Amino acid sequence: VEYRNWSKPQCQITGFAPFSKDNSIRLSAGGDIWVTREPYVSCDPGKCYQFALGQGTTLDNKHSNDTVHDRIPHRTLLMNELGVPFHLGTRQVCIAWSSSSCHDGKAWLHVCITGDDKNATASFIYDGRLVDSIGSWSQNILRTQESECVCINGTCTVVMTDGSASGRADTRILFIEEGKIVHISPLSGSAQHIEECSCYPRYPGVRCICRDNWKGSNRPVVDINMEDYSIDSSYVCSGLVGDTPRNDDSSSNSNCRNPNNERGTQGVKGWAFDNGNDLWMGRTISKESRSGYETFKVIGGWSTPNSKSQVNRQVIVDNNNWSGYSGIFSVEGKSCINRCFYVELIRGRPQETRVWWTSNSIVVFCGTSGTYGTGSWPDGANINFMPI
Amino acid sequence: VEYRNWSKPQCQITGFAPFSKDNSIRLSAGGDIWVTREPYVSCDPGKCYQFALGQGTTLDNKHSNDTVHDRIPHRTLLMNELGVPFHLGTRQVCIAWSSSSCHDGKAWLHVCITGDDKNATASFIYDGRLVDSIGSWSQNILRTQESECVCINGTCTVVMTDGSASGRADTRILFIEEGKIVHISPLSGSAQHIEECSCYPRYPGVRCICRDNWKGSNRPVVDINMEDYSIDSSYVCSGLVGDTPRNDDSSSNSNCRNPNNERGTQGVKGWAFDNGNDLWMGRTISKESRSGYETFKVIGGWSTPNSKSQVNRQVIVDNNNWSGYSGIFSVEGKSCINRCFYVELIRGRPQETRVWWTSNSIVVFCGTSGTYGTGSWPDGANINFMPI
Amino acid sequence: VEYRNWSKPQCQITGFAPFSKDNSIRLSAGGDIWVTREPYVSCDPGKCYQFALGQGTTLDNKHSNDTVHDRIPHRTLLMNELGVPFHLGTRQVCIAWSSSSCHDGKAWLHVCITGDDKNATASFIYDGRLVDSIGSWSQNILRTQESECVCINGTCTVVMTDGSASGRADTRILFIEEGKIVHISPLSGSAQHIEECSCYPRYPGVRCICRDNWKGSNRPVVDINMEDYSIDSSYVCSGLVGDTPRNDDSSSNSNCRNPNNERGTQGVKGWAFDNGNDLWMGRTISKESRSGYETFKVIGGWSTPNSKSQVNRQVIVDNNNWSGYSGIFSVEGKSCINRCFYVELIRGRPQETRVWWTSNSIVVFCGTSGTYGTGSWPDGANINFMPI
Amino acid sequence: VEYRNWSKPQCQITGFAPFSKDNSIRLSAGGDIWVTREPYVSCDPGKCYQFALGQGTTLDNKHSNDTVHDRIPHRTLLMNELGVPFHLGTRQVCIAWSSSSCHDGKAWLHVCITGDDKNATASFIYDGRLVDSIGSWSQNILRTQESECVCINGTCTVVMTDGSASGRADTRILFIEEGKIVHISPLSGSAQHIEECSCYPRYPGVRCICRDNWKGSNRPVVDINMEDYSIDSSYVCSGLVGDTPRNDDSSSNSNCRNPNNERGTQGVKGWAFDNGNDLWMGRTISKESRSGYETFKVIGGWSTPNSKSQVNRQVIVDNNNWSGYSGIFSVEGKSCINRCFYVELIRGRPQETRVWWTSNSIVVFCGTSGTYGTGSWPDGANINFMPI
Ligand SMILES: *[C@@H]1O[C@H](CO)[C@@H](O[C@@H]2O[C@H](CO)[C@@H](O[C@@H]3O[C@H](CO)[C@@H](O)[C@H](O[C@H]4O[C@H](CO)[C@@H](O)[C@H](O)[C@@H]4O)[C@@H]3O)[C@H](O)[C@H]2NC(C)=O)[C@H](O)[C@H]1NC(C)=O
Ligand SMILES: *[C@@H]1O[C@H](CO)[C@@H](O[C@@H]2O[C@H](CO)[C@@H](O[C@@H]3O[C@H](CO)[C@@H](O)[C@H](O[C@H]4O[C@H](CO)[C@@H](O)[C@H](O)[C@@H]4O)[C@@H]3O)[C@H](O)[C@H]2NC(C)=O)[C@H](O)[C@H]1NC(C)=O
Ligand SMILES: *[C@@H]1O[C@H](CO)[C@@H](O[C@@H]2O[C@H](CO)[C@@H](O[C@@H]3O[C@H](CO)[C@@H](O)[C@H](O[C@H]4O[C@H](CO)[C@@H](O)[C@H](O)[C@@H]4O)[C@@H]3O)[C@H](O)[C@H]2NC(C)=O)[C@H](O)[C@H]1NC(C)=O
Ligand SMILES: *[C@@H]1O[C@H](CO)[C@@H](O[C@@H]2O[C@H](CO)[C@@H](O[C@@H]3O[C@H](CO)[C@@H](O)[C@H](O[C@H]4O[C@H](CO)[C@@H](O)[C@H](O)[C@@H]4O)[C@@H]3O)[C@H](O)[C@H]2NC(C)=O)[C@H](O)[C@H]1NC(C)=O
Ligand SMILES: *[C@@H]1O[C@H](CO)[C@@H](O[C@@H]2O[C@H](CO)[C@@H](O)[C@H](O)[C@H]2NC(C)=O)[C@H](O)[C@H]1NC(C)=O
Ligand SMILES: *[C@@H]1O[C@H](CO)[C@@H](O[C@@H]2O[C@H](CO)[C@@H](O)[C@H](O)[C@H]2NC(C)=O)[C@H](O)[C@H]1NC(C)=O
Ligand SMILES: *[C@@H]1O[C@H](CO)[C@@H](O[C@@H]2O[C@H](CO)[C@@H](O)[C@H](O)[C@H]2NC(C)=O)[C@H](O)[C@H]1NC(C)=O
Ligand SMILES: CO[C@@H]([C@@H]1OC(C(=O)O)=C[C@H](NC(=N)N)[C@H]1NC(C)=O)[C@H](O)CO
Ligand SMILES: CO[C@@H]([C@@H]1OC(C(=O)O)=C[C@H](NC(=N)N)[C@H]1NC(C)=O)[C@H](O)CO
Ligand SMILES: CO[C@@H]([C@@H]1OC(C(=O)O)=C[C@H](NC(=N)N)[C@H]1NC(C)=O)[C@H](O)CO
Ligand SMILES: CO[C@@H]([C@@H]1OC(C(=O)O)=C[C@H](NC(=N)N)[C@H]1NC(C)=O)[C@H](O)CO
Ligand SMILES: *[C@@H]1O[C@H](CO)[C@@H](O)[C@H](O)[C@H]1NC(C)=O
Ligand SMILES: [Ca+2]
Ligand SMILES: [Ca+2]
Ligand SMILES: [Ca+2]
Ligand SMILES: [Ca+2]
């Protein structure tokens, strides 16, 4: 087996087609299913896997109470084949309240963070064994992507942040070979706050669209040079911005370089990718809450500041339904690299108070060069039918 | 591994022998089992798999209420080794309220349809990745076989329909290579309505026996030429007709060419196959409801219009028990290709109203050249023992 | 992979050592576990599997009521790796209320009998496909070994009986190559009634120790010549007889040739094997009921009529606990063939009437050339703790 | 596949990083999970597995009552991939109330002890078959490591004891090749009582840190020469002793040679390993009970009698939480052999009497040459939420 290089052109897509749905919450009402959040998808050269951070409990279980909280020692990284719900036979791959995983063509890398808020540990597990670890450098919630890392020619890269959630933080980009950290680069460029990067291979480098939790409702961009380890960063050009919260479309802005200072505080993990001058992106339908999910192409959204002409919109989850995090993953085809995305469908607290837990299901779409119709694929559970 | 060509003669059979039974509904009364309908079977070169469309819920689960409905966003294609019940570790292969699957000798193809009735999307997944998609062409419930597609020399074919369920519709035959649609041929010939084809390899081509939901209780036949993509169609000759509803045997007719206009509206998915001038077929025992199931050979049933001489009858499910959809699948043996079939055993609504759900189990038989006895192999659940 | 020839000498054993226990009934009180009976064990060249006839239901399930009955259409052959309890993910390999399975070194053969008492069907499934079938020849409960068949050089043999349970019956020995019946030999010799043979390879032939349900509490022997298909039969010489019911040790007899007419009617499946002039055998401890289980070597038990000197006794299940069927299986070692056995531990009806079901667990022992101690390994469930 | 030689240098470590956690008890409150104790971890050349002794029952099950007891016939060795909780699909590998397992590079060896206290049997299972067995030599609870054995060049060694738990006993070191005992060496050296050895490869030999249940709160050391089968033994030099119970640090002693006679009776399974003159070790935080868990390096802890200079302490489980047994396992990396350890987290009786059962979960850490922070990773179940 050979290392992945991702050295094919990006598939020319017309939009996205339905790929997977796990129905986790509906099933939790009649079966033993893990409580999770922060899911993502990543594929080895043959097949795709779904990941999520468990809460060390199933849903119909008194331990599900108060699982809205982000970090406990019992959170572990769950990994199943895509479409297999997180049942009790699910393997816990490592201890983690923040994680990233990727396959370099030969084996899986998992980056797993756990421990005290002020002094966390990131473990690097490769081909089923612990190879390296690093401790918190800013003593303030060391944290990473919550989606797939990217490997080119045996070197994988992952973005990690330590420091304030609402101010200048310390972001670093790690380069990892067979689980061993070989280089660490500081963030450089004009992005002012970076969290939860959704990264994809863009040979010969890697590109990430992230979350600015401080001053921007426009999404930061991080560009990683795999050859000399140099880093650059900026903001997505599109005037149709990707974060939540954000201003409405008529009053949102981005200049490609700075956070827009428009309802910039807080945010949600999301994604986007460039195609020439244009941009494919997803976002919540609601500008204030994690409700609904839509994708579209912005004409000039990559190259033209404040561009707002969109086309090829698709509703993924209608605005009467809860969404959550979303992220990108890439899949190598015969002659091109396709882009896919997942969206987290969060149920329970804080939005739905009949129950005491917080969990999620997922829905997954992949780029297509063919044609498609319309629909909406929400979580689908009836909150009144759930164990509280 | 090589592409399948199915280039062996058809096995000479004397009837069918018991092969598999999953007992899904009996088990659902004491375990967490998926609610499903529209099951089918298909084998890779090594082993057989059972498929079905989940309802995004288990049976003992409040979400099982009102699962009689055909199309919701939460339906997904389930896939297990044949004989493994749909428990919570079952993989959901794609999002689908209509589907077909087949293995070309190298990898699995799944065709999965979901979304809005008037604007559905068909996804084509090959070797674990989304390769193509197509949108609705008549804006009226794009739909496909609900049984295995057939591949010869790396080209797979699947029959799809869009348009009226009770009038002229738009049926097309897709040719697919490694997940990519390479050609689409319109239906041609004298079949006037085509749904839910049960197809089998008949080298060098493919033959399908389908459901006419409009004017015929005789089953349409679709012949597919894999070399030039040409299509022909007609109706099964046998005067013992295969649809439900239908006239009783003394007053049923087929002329091989036209729908018989005998209780033609509505129908059920079924199968038949030719052996020279003769026909092997199955059908429900009841002529008006999906109750019981029988198989038999009709002498001259392939070649002689209105032939009604049967022999080698076998009861599969006695008429005091519910059946449902049925379909064919083919299995390559050492020197010949065998024909097998499955029967969907529907329990719950609308026929049994003590419970609020609709689900099924399955029973499976394979052609034999040996001898056999008699029996009946129904679902076997006691409706009074079930969670409602 | 090559066909098995079993052409190594038999292991010299000093007794048996603990190998496996599944604890099915204890687990059934807190988990979804199949109701089964008539288990057995068989190994491919790499690993062992446990088999049993399911009753189409789990134990904590209203359908478990009245599972004391032997034959219903919902019984299927279950197959797991040895030591994996029959949970809901268990594969049902075929439809069967009587079965036998074996691996020829290349693939599995399953012989599965189901259908009407007076007209049953045996299906032969090889390498995952139905290859042959045969119908009842005496119209009276066609039935087979309920333990492993034996294959030498690609030809597998299995013993089947059709006819009276309490009088002359029609026993036949089938020879099967890759699932295809190639020859059928009538029983010959002096055994007067043959059921439920426990067979083992004894190169160049196969030897079976069976159950006489008519006139003998001494066990019949069937010898199968794999080269010319000839059959011989007689009775185990040992004066310590293996069936239940039977006379006490002081008044039991066997002459090697005829049924002993000592509490001969009824019986239980059991096993024995020869070592030179001596005999290793197991049996219930109770002479009248399926209670307890013991193994020992009878000096001259193979060659000397009415021999009663035993040595190397081991209690497997003490007499205060229920047992049931037992059978032999053989395992190829580096330089010899080992013999192992399982015993079925029956719980519920008819002996324990607090509950309405009948099920079993298993315990498994293997021949050893080493040393060992003592113990008792019964089912271990508390009938008062069970769902009724 | 080749035999393991473990012929690489030991990894230089700075401490330990989080590796795995199974959350067994939390999950048991909402799912069917095995009752277990005496867990351990061992890896084949590709991946790691978790083992434990089941109690033949799930936790939410009336049979979980009184599972504090050490030895019943229903205990079996469970084996899952590391991180997969012991659900109902878990394989029971053999019958055992004491065990050890290891992989020699080609196949798994399991050593399984069961039966009567005064006459137990040890079974040796290699590559899925029973190869050897040995009976009790002192008629007083034959028992072994409860952690991984170690194989070099096709010879596996395991430490077994028979005799008094509180006085002179009979300890022997077995040498095993493909499951067959080829040599047995008596314990030699100055260790006066040996139980539950935690062994690791230290090419060309094997080293074990054990439990003295009689006179020492310092841990015995056993050195095994794999070339001539010679044995040596002594006690860990460190004045910071590893057993529980023990004296406080100010008044604890070890002279490297004799048991210290400081709260020597009783004990708990634990581990340590050498790095030059220094010692890495773990122990409960409490000196009297199985509460808390800490690791640290003792400068001169291997070579300097009574050394008490520690550095690089890490809390693994804070002292407000229950621990239990702990043990070492070794993982071969690209250029070195790493050392890892697991901690058993015991819940229920005798410490927590709200419930009537005794079970455990596990947490697992691996050596790292990188950096790390702080935390505590206890079982995490709320005893008040548990089925009693
Ligand atoms: C059947 O399905 C197809 C495919 O999904 C669908 O065609 C699509 O329709 C949408 C909506 O009209 C198109 O996307 C739009 O493109 C225009 C530019 O041409 C944009 O202006 C639109 O954005 C505005 O309107 C949106 C609401 O529709 C707002 O949310 C947004 O803020 C803007 O105000 C939007 O991007 C899309 O291009 C086509 N896709 C293709 C491939 O043609 C079709 O309509 C469906 N038919 C029915 C009747 O369901
Ligand atoms: C033991 O099992 C065997 C094998 O299943 C069984 O033999 C079969 O019997 C049936 C019924 O007699 C045969 O099928 C019939 O064939 C005749 C032509 O020879 C047809 O006329 C029959 O059709 C008419 O009758 C049917 C009801 O039986 C009606 O439903 C139908 O509409 C027609 O009116 C029917 O097809 C079959 O050929 C044999 N099979 C073989 C291989 O011989 C046997 O009877 C069983 N024995 C017992 C006592 O159970
Ligand atoms: C520790 O375990 C060992 C191994 O299990 C055990 O040694 C065995 O003891 C039994 C019982 O004494 C021996 O089997 C006996 O052999 C004699 C002939 O030498 C027979 O006469 C015995 O049969 C008679 O007695 C039986 C009851 O014991 C009756 O059931 C039977 O009907 C006969 O009347 C019996 O076969 C066996 O040979 C040894 N095994 C070996 C290898 O030595 C030992 O006793 C155990 N120690 C203790 C004290 O538990
Ligand atoms: C963030 O995490 C890091 C890494 O875990 C942590 O650094 C570690 O701190 C501990 C505690 O200070 C160090 O271990 C100590 O080393 C000294 C020798 O230098 C020993 O004397 C200590 O033992 C004494 O004190 C213990 C209590 O701390 C007693 O239990 C013991 O009996 C002795 O009296 C102890 O071994 C360790 O070396 C460092 N690790 C590294 C690699 O630097 C750091 O403190 C954390 N920061 C915060 C604010 O949480
Ligand atoms: C399944 O859902 C149905 C429909 O919601 C439930 O029956 C309804 O109950 C409401 C309120 O009690 C009535 O007003 C409706 O008339 C009922 N609908 C029908 C068509 O009868 C039913 O209770 C649910 N079943 C279960 C087991 O919860
Ligand atoms: C198992 O089934 C039997 C038979 O139905 C049940 O026993 C019967 O219960 C019915 C219904 O109340 C009574 O009318 C009969 O008198 C009973 N028959 C006998 C033979 O006593 C039994 O209750 C069922 N067991 C369980 C646990 O449901
Ligand atoms: C677990 O088993 C114990 C022992 O049988 C049960 O406690 C006993 O209950 C009996 C009957 O009331 C008393 O007479 C004994 O004194 C109790 N034993 C002890 C040690 O207290 C207990 O009820 C069982 N637990 C559960 C949850 O069923
Ligand atoms: C603390 O909040 C951060 C993360 O935010 C959220 C959320 O749903 O918004 C979920 C995460 N949950 C987990 N990954 N477990 C957080 N991240 C962490 C490390 O808590 C945020 O990005 C600010 O730094
Ligand atoms: C709408 O009815 C169609 C299908 O019919 C039925 C039925 O049990 O008859 C089940 C399917 N259920 C699913 N495949 N989910 C339907 N087909 C669809 C696509 O709904 C029919 O063939 C007429 O067009
Ligand atoms: C009818 O009884 C026969 C079989 O006996 C028994 C038993 O526990 O004794 C279990 C079987 N149960 C199943 N195998 N299912 C039977 N065999 C059959 C075919 O019923 C007996 O050997 C006489 O013929
Ligand atoms: C009897 O106690 C021994 C073992 O003790 C412990 C314990 O938690 O301390 C658990 C074991 N439980 C199991 N291994 N099942 C015991 N060992 C046995 C064989 O009982 C001890 O080391 C003294 O000899
Ligand atoms: C869940 O925990 C909360 C907070 O501690 C408490 O207020 C509430 O009563 C609990 N709810 C349930 C369902 O037990
Ligand atoms: Ca923001
Ligand atoms: Ca019709
Ligand atoms: Ca008898
Ligand atoms: Ca001690």
Numbering used by the authors:
A (entry chain B), B (entry chain C), C (entry chain D), D (entry chain A): 82 to 469
Authors' own words:
NA, which is a sialidase, catalyzes hydrolysis of terminally linked sialic acid and functions as the receptor-destroying element of influenza A and B viruses. Additionally, influenza A NA is further classified into two groups: group 1 (N1, N4, N5 and N8) and group 2 (N2, N3, N6, N7 and N9), based upon primary sequence. Group 1 NAs contain a 150-cavity (formed by amino acids 147–151 of the 150-loop) in their active site, whereas group 2 NAs lack this cavity. NA inhibition assays were carried out and complex crystal structures were solved for laninamivir, laninamivir octanoate, zanamivir and oseltamivir in order to elucidate the structural basis of their inhibition.
Like the available group 2 A/TOKYO/3/1967 (H2N2) N2 and A/Memphis/31/98 (H3N2) N2 structures, p57N2 also contains a 150-cavity deficient active site with a salt bridge between Asp147 and His150, confirming the presence of a stable, closed 150-loop. To determine the structural basis of the inhibition of laninamivir relative to zanamivir, we solved the very first complex structures of laninamivir with p57N2, p09N1 and N5 at resolutions of 1.8 Å, 1.8 Å and 1.6 Å, respectively; and the complex structures of zanamivir with p57N2, p09N1 and N5 at 1.9 Å, 1.9 Å and 1.6 Å, respectively. Like zanamivir, the binding mode of laninamivir to all 3 NAs is highly similar to that of the NA transition state analogue, Neu5Ac2en. Although this laninamivir 7-methoxy group is oriented away from its own ring oxygen and is pointed toward the hydrophobic Ile222 side chain, its distance is relative far at over 5 Å. On the other hand, the carboxylate-Arg292 interactions are further in zanamivir than laninamivir in every NA complex. Laninamivir was in a similar range with zanamivir for N5, p09N1 and p57N2 with IC50 values of 0.90 nM, 1.83 nM and 3.12 nM, respectively. Group 2 p57N2 contains an Asp147-His150 salt bridge, limiting the flexibility of its closed 150-loop and inhibition of p57N2 by laninamivir was the lowest. p09N1 is an atypical group 1 with no 150-cavity, but no Asp147-His150 salt bridge, and inhibition of p09N1 by laninamivir was better than p57N2.
